[PDB]
Ligand code: HEM
Ligand code: HEM
């Protein structure tokens with residue numbers, strides 16, 4: 034019941050007691066482990082108050098006022114407000130705490146050593162999609178900071194009856210369009226083909242290019258979503274060149290500086306925030322391994338290996354592995370040259386081990402999903418590969434939610 | 444009930460029903476996943492259900508479930524259990540059991556080959572000298588002059604737990620490690636403790652960087668005994684690089700035959716505590732783990748030095764670059780010497796084909812994503828994108844304690 038995790042490279046053993054405060058479920062049973070499943074998964078008055086109490090208990094404990102004057106009053110006041118209104122409103126301090134701890138609790142996030150330095154933008158007074166656009170532009174500008182990226186989240190009004198949902202329809206604030214070609218292939222980002230169509234097949238004027246920044250599709254108060262173009266001067270992009278291969282720049286590659294997830298649901302004290310875009314900065318492998326070299330994405334491995342003149346006859350020449358490394362050197366080199374914040378996988382995974390040690394010491398544990406924390410290249414030469422991790426679900430949390438074009442009462 | 448797994452690269456969705464036949468536990472609960480944890484004395488009370496379950500599976504596989512032969516064998520095993528408190532497997536049952544323990548090994552990416560296992564029945568063995576002879580014959584057969592063949596040798600099953608057969612080596616062929624007084628290590632740091640035991644048991648160590656360890660073999664619960672594998676039976680491969688002529692001067696070599704010897708084979712409730720098995724290497728086992736783990740031979744520095752990469756900042760990816768070149772050299776060396784090896788691209792593709800076939804013909808394939816995904820180039824192999832369900836089926840291979848921690852020395 035008091036569990037231990039071992040690092041097999043260093044023999045360091047940590048003792049986890051935090052998991053005993055886990056609330057939600059993992060998808061696993063003692064008969065079957067679902068650790069590699071990508072997606073392992075109204076609201077009444079009964080359910081809401083224990084959730085608020087659990088959250089307020091940990092909030093007042095965190096400020097060393099558990100069982101105090103203000104603690105009992107706040108508990109009473111929220112209880113009064115739920116009994117009356119069937120919901121409640123977070124104090125600004127509780128919202129900031131809840132958002133920072135949702136990130137602290139994100140077991141798939143390797144960047145959590147930064148969790149306490151998060152800029153929380155309270156957008157709970159927003160009422161229209163034009164107001165949403167305004168808040169998102171300000172977020173993008175703040176977070177981008179001319180390349181000196183700063184972590185931020187913008188929190189739109191919480192769900193009420195499920196009919197008045199605020200939703201950002203984009204999966205990330207900044208992504209590249211994808212169109213299926215006449216000759217059967219795909220131009221741009223294949224992952225965004227259905228979305229790039231919903232933008233066109235409902236308003237947008239696509240420049241049908243390969244790296245077209247998609248428009249925002251914003252939904253306020255349950256209404257139909259509206260299209261907005263992010264001002265291009267707010268979208269920091271990096272042309273990708275290689276520090277050795279001069280032909281690399283001729284590949285035509287670029288990527289955007291700001292990774293900003295916008296389709297997750299933020300849960301704090303039972304309250305659900307369905308529009309809560311958040312951003313940090315890239316780990317190099319997200320772009321160079323996944324975005325560029327996945328077969329279902331831009332899938333550039335063949336072209337790069339050909340220009341390197343590698344033996345592509347046999348897989349055992351490891352031509353894919355060689356090109357992969359060069360592509361990721363170029364991504365890192367390009368961002369660093371343009372003074373755009375980026376972290377390589379060696380530095381980020383080292384940071385996470387230090388974060389884990391901090392969390393075990395000051396908190397008694399750190400939920401972590403090994404399948405997601407280990408980078409998608411060079412796994413075993415990073416320290417996290419050799420680190421046993423316990424995965425469990427703590428709240429406040431970021432959760433997945435259905436894509437809105439499958440749920441919108443249109 | 445049914446369970447579905449999806450491949451996010453190809454959108455193929457498979458449906459698992461085999462997990463219903465799972466019995467052992469995973470370590471996980473509804474509230475915690477132990478998927479990345481490395482490691483999550485038997486009476487007649489529990490033995491006959493285990494035997495009956497196994498014999499049901501065996502007679503089903505041969506299309507004889509419920510036949511007179513099936514019923515007579517159950518009756519015969521039942522009587523032998525209450526008469527003798529254990530039972531003996533037929534040769535055919537042992538072969539089926541060993542093949543299916545491999546088929547059920549959720550951490551093994553090489554399972555497309557499970558039905559072509561050569562099973563050596565060594566249940567008549569009585570002494571450590573006899574174990575040595577069986578293991579020599581296994582090594583010669585499996586090596587096959589570089590054309591490797593999968594094999595397993597099965598020594599007598601556990602009785603009261605005081606008479607165990609054990610191979611004290613973790614693998615039949617491994618290099619020694621020696622801790623120096625200055626704190627540095629010569630050879631394989633993974634094997635320092637076992638090397639100390641061998642030395643204490645009388646082994647005369649050459650004290651080089653690639654000394655093949657002696658076999659330390661325990662029969663019938665007696666103290667273990669040292670034996671040197673005849674060197675002409677240990678096939679080794681000097682490592683060189685197809686383009687880098689200085690790579691040979693690093694002085695690296697490795698052995699051809701990977702042969703695990705510390706696991707326990709469970710078949711029908713019977714426990715075979717000495718069951719060495721062997722296949723052939725996937726290149727990354729040597730080039731990534733054996734050579735580049737910080738806690739193993741740890742050659743990333745010197746390789747990158749000789750390559751003259753920028754080693755001052757990690758963001759040059761000098762480690763990633765040297766890692767690839769080393770793994771090219773491993774594959775090139777084995778192929779050039781005509782010693783069986785498989786690269787991680789081929790092995791993971793074969794495993795995906797295996798897994799799909801197992802879903803079609805068997806209703807599932809238990810698989811441990813954490814171990815199946817190779818330790819370099821993860822997402823450019825197809826297993827990275829493949830959802831997998833992990834569960835425990837029997838027959839199975841299990842971990843067991845290191846014998847020096849449990850053995851009662853006879854002196
Ligand atoms: C500041 C630097 C950050 C870095 C380097 C970083 C790194 C990463 C990486 C590499 C992933 C895996 C995502 C993937 O492979 O698709 C991830 C996931 C995630 N990150 Fe972080 N992140 C950062 C900031 C943040 C922030 C500011 C938040 C929230 C406030 C956050 C919340 C999450 C969540 C919830 C996931 C899981 C996404 C999912 O389950 O699909 N991250 N992060
Ligand atoms: C024929 C070629 C084979 C290949 C390419 C192969 C590949 C692998 C690899 C790469 C691993 C992970 C090992 C590690 O990272 O330390 C593994 C694990 C394993 N293999 Fe296979 N294997 C083969 C044959 C066999 C055979 C013949 C058996 C048994 C009869 C077997 C049973 C297992 C088991 C039980 C594990 C789990 C090891 C553990 O939990 O430590 N494999 N295999």
Ligand SMILES: Cc1cc(N)nc(CCc2cc(CCCN(C)C)c(F)c(F)c2F)c1
Nearest residue numbers: 204292293294296311312313314315316433
């Ligand atoms: C703040 C942040 C920093 C960073 N460095 N990286 C990311 C990227 C996280 C991510 C999250 C998701 C899940 C939500 C999307 N939908 C499909 C549910 C992805 F899908 C995805 F591709 C993806 F990159 C975010």
Ligand SMILES: Cc1cc(N)nc(CCc2cc(CCCN(C)C)c(F)c(F)c2F)c1
Nearest residue numbers: 613701702703705720721722723724725728
């Ligand atoms: C037949 C086979 C083919 C192949 N291609 N590869 C292997 C290697 C499996 C392996 C298994 C273990 C299990 C014992 C665990 N104990 C020592 C903690 C190892 F340790 C180890 F190093 C190791 F390589 C085996």
Ligand SMILES: C[C@H](O)[C@H](O)[C@H]1CNc2nc(N)[nH]c(=O)c2N1
Nearest residue numbers: 069070071404405827828829830
């Ligand atoms: C099937 C498997 O769970 C899936 O491919 C996961 C593996 N690990 C991952 N890890 C990260 N960081 N991001 C991902 O998208 C994935 N995909």
Ligand SMILES: C[C@H](O)[C@H](O)[C@H]1CNc2nc(N)[nH]c(=O)c2N1
Nearest residue numbers: 418419420421479480481813814
């Ligand atoms: C902590 C973690 O479970 C451990 O390092 C695992 C990760 N996956 C692995 N996968 C393989 N094939 N072999 C290993 O030794 C390991 N080690």
Ligand SMILES: [Zn+2]
Nearest residue numbers: 061066471476
């Ligand atoms: Zn699990």
